[PDB]
Amino acid sequence: TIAWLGRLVIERIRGIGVAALMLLQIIFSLPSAGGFGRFVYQMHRVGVMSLLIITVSGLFIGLVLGLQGYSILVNVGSESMLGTMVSLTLLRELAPVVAALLFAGRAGSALTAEIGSMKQSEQLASMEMIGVDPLKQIVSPRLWAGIVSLPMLTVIFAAIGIVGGKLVGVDFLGVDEGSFWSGMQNNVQFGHDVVNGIIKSIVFALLCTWIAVFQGYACDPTPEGIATAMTRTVVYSSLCVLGFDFVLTAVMFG
Template identity: 60%
Template sequence: MSIGILDRVAQLGRFGLDQIQSIGRAGVFLILAIFSRAGFSNRFSLLTQQLYSVGVMSLIIVTVSGLFIGMVLALQGYNILIRYGSEDAVGQMVALSLLRELGPVVTALLFAGRAGSALTAEIGLMKTTEQLSSMEMIGVDPLKRVIAPRFWAGVISMPLLAAIFSLVGILGAVMVGVDWLGIYEGSFWSSMQASVSLVADIGNGLIKSLVFGFVVTWIAVFQGYDAIPTSEGVSRATTRTVVYSSLAILGLDFILTAVMFGEL
């Protein structure tokens, strides 16, 4: 029986070591990808291509989700605030919750599902079909040629997507709150403008989305690069990307919120 318990402990230890090892590998991988100087004349067009598949292709889902979330927030907020005669505060409520929380977080979750999983699958497939090896044999570092442009495209796209999400959300709230429920437009905007601050709300939301973009893309490209080169390995890596990114987003969101808005 005691052997059984020891085995369990050893298993746990091995699991812990594996995890730490893979975090270490991911760190080295990231540093190599970011700080390697790409010697290609066409690295700008490589980045453009990735901005297209990572950023532009995520636009539709981000815009549609933002619109609906803004509309729902306005509707829910109105129904509660009308009881206190403060329906003017709907604008303020929607803007603050979008800029501080929902914009960065929901965009990052959608981004992980849409772009992150696609990145992992694409890189994993390139590994499975030996494209990465053959690139190495031709004398090109896949970290520079394949990983770096995808990573930067993710980091650049995320804040832009989050800004679009928040703006579309607020416009959705205007549609529901002002045009449909009949909140007076002037006080809708003025209550918003009185409480939203450029640095504390928009700036911090932007920082959040940058951090999320960095982490999600990092997880996605590493999982693809580290995938076991079989179809099963790639599909597992894709699942891991979505799970790890979602957990990382929500955990980091709490930490960032505590640091940014903790004193208030």
């Protein structure tokens, strides 16, 4: 009856312990430099194949911020405020979260599904007998592609969001280019409004990809488990991004 929940919680938490151990091995020892020349290939499916989604969302978010900012800011200071609010919002809160979640979706479920199949088909297992450690051959380049790709995407998301904001806020709705640009320069500091967006992005890139690899590399070889793993990678990295985003922003701007 009740003990059921008890057992569920106990096992899920044991699994986090396992994930921590896996992460340690993959990051801790990677001497096979000759085979890491392929991670550039792996990046194709994490980074290159995801620009379309990040770019389109960045444009819609920029345009939305432009319109909502404007309808509020006409009562307070659009001439000075569209610039400052569009750029701070995108650099501090949205590029690191919206790109992080779209990424967790598009790259995250695809990646976990792929590791999942590698395990389910027994293909991965056959490598143990050939002496090729699957963590160094299969997992390593996938985790690294995730680390590099999300941060570069995060920057693009914001770059597009700025275009979106200006396109409506300045060009269709009647605001000065001068004060838009100077306002942004007056209030946006590289140190640390641009820099903190990047730091949060690295944290999310590691946490989110780490989960996707871990769940794909599941214990139970049952077909039902692939769909379960895919749903869970989206849910867990999604909450983790929001949880960590809160703490990091609390420090960075508090």
